[PDB]
Amino acid sequence: MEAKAVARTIRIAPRKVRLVLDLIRGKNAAEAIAILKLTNKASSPVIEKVLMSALANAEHNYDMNTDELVVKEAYANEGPTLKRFRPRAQGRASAINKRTSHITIVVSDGK
């Protein structure tokens, strides 16, 4: 079986989220929690809430025991942007992109 949980329109950029997801992908859930809770990056709280949501709604809805679980696929997709403007010199503008993400975390018992 499988369970997932998602987080959409996250303010962090995907290049800066995927760095952390590369540490979670394919690992025990408690291990992965600790990775996130000990890494000083700023996407790690958000990934952690997605993860604990997955574990919660697996334990609740699909009825799986939290112990046996591993992180099967944790992926981050580009969401929208918010286009912004940083004034550089001589009347020239320079664009800024406040990128977004779609943090997904999928949890399995191995069968």
Partner 1 sequence: AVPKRRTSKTRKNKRRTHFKISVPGMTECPNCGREYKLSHRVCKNCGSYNGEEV
Partner 2 sequence: YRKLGRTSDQRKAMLRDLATSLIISERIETTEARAKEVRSVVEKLITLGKKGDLASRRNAAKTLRNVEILNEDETTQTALQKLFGEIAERYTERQGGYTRILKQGPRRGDGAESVIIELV
Binding site for partner 2 (CB under 8 A): 38, 40, 42
Contact flag: residue 56 with RNA (CB under 7 A): yes
Partner that binds at residue 23, options partner 2, partner 1, RNA, none, CB closer than 5 to 8 Å by kind: partner 1
**Looking at 10, 23, 50, 71, which residue binds partner 1 (CB under 8 A)?**
23
Q: Which is nearer to partner 1, 41 or 49 (CB)?
A: 41
DSSP annotation of 59: I
DSSP annotation of 67: G
**C-beta of 39: minimal distance to partner 2 in Å?**
9
Locate tokens 């962090």: which residue? 12
What distances in angstroms separate CA 42 from CA 6, 22, 34, 70, 86, one per listed residue?
17, 15, 14, 23, 23
Question: Partners of 106 in the beta sheet?
Answer: 4, 73
Say which amino acid occupies 14. P
In the range 61-100, which residues lie near RNA by CB under 7 A?
A: 61, 73, 75-84, 86-87, 97-99
CB 20 within 8 A of CB 39: yes
Residues that bind partner 1 (CB under 8 A): 19-20, 22-23, 30-31, 34-35, 38-39, 41
